[PDB]
Design a protein around this ligand. Sequence first.
Ligand SMILES: Cc1ccccc1OCC(=O)Nc1ccc2[nH]nnc2c1
Ligand SMILES: *[C@@H]1O[C@H](CO)[C@@H](O)[C@H](O)[C@H]1NC(C)=O
Length: 360
Amino acid sequence: EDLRLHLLLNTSVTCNDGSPAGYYLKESRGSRRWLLFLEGGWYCFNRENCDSRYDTMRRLMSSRDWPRTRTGTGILSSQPEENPYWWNANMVFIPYCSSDVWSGASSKSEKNEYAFMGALIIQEVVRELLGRGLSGAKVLLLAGSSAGGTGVLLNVDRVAEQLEKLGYPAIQVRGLADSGWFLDNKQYRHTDCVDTITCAPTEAIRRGIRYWNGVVPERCRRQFQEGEEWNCFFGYKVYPTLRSPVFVVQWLFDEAQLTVDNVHLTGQPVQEGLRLYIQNLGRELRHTLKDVPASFAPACLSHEIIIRSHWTDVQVKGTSLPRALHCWDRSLHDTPLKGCPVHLVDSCPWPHCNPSCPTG
Ligand SMILES: Cc1ccccc1OCC(=O)Nc1ccc2[nH]nnc2c1
Ligand SMILES: *[C@@H]1O[C@H](CO)[C@@H](O)[C@H](O)[C@H]1NC(C)=O
């Protein structure tokens, strides 16, 4: 009940169906910390699959049925028992209603059945919050899970630039990308992109960018250039182009990654081909995080962590995620810290080799 809905006052910034986008807010009068969380929820990339999403996932495409309040959980909780890290922060939950991995900049019109405005929704939320206390902030942490985690990578630097051009260069913009660090790897079984379920992420995102009028960070765009902006949706490719500090949270054996790799576990014995596939996926993920100084990557088969009520339970090398985020805060005061690590990547090679992995 802690977060209260506000629909955007700028009615031109809309969910997929043209209804107003919005945000849920719980203010903390004492605090100059602001947490803006980007909800996840896959994406759609053509008329037919967006139509189907509108039938059975309408809250991800429309505000018409949104409730007036939401309960803050995990990193959005205001109870220190549940949220050791930022329980006293101003809390913002931004519903994902643009189906575009937070990248879109296109309105519904005579040529567009749907609006894809994810990148504009974030900018408009930031603008409207500045009159609600964000103008006094010292840190704005843009966080997100799954498609919202990818959205952090695509938008954190644009939020920084926006605040600079609005006259607030003192607000420190940082990112926390959870479960949004995907690999454009070989699938375990492969299909040509002939419909929605057969379309590999690289091809689905390439089509999505054109359907959404998707935008990516400027430095990444200049590296990959026209026709190749889909590359900037892959964390290991976009991360090195970013200037804002970003903490990366990623399960080594993410269930969404395995799904897009056409791996479906049943509990039956894993044979050698699939064993090597899974072990190689964990090794590749670990490799992409080698030069990411702020990261938390447990060897578990799971998906998302930061808004889960029991997010405090998982540890890597004996350090929980709330502790690692606290150590990250200390490291950004402006040399490593004794017993306060920020780079926590498991080295064991199979899901649940870490005993603190979520049970399910
Ligand atoms: C794949 C990919 C590559 C680069 C960037 C984003 C991305 O995808 C975002 C997402 O949200 N994906 C997703 C997949 C499978 C899922 N199963 N359940 N939720 C799921 C979400
Ligand atoms: C409303 O949003 C649109 C799209 O982002 C933007 O072009 C316009 O300037 C905004 N209007 C105001 C008053 O902020």
